[PDB]
């Protein structure tokens, strides 16, 4: 009784970093292509009124050597 929990939907997930990581995770885990999964996530984020958004995917798919990919659209400052 001295501790209380409440849930709470979140005003657009499209502007939550965490929301979209877990989306990607679920996308690639659900056996989705890669560029599909990324560009999809980016284009929903942008569509959700973002100023800019960037998705890196690192590690290894199918080939034995690791690679990485940048997926980005719009605007981002990086400093200060």
């Amino acid at each position: 009784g001295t501790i209380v929990l409440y849930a709470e939907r979140v005003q657009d997930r499209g502007l939550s970093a965490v929301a979209q990581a877990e989306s990607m995770k679920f996308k690639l885990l659900n056996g989705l292509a890669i560029r599909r999964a990324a560009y999809g996530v980016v284009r929903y984020v942008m569509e959700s009124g973002a100023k800019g958004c960037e998705v890196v995917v690192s590690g290894k798919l199918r080939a034995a050597r690791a690679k990485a990919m940048k997926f980005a659209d719009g605007f981002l400052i990086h400093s200060g």
Partner: protein, 55 residues
């Protein structure tokens, strides 16, 4: 045991001191391979279908 240790000649400084020093002491870093860092030894290689599936 401890009786052996003091009784044992061929022990203690006086002895070592009077022995030549190996040259393996004054050695180098040995290094061994680095000029072969970028050349994969796996023998294997990937392929352009597999990288194109995954990525």
């Amino acid at each position: 045991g401890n009786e052996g240790a003091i009784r044992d000649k061929t022990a203690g400084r006086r002895n070592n001191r009077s022995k030549d020093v190996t040259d393996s002491a004054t050695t180098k870093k040995s290094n061994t391979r680095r000029a072969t860092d970028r050349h994969s030894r796996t023998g294997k290689t990937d392929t352009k279908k597999k990288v194109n599936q995954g990525w």
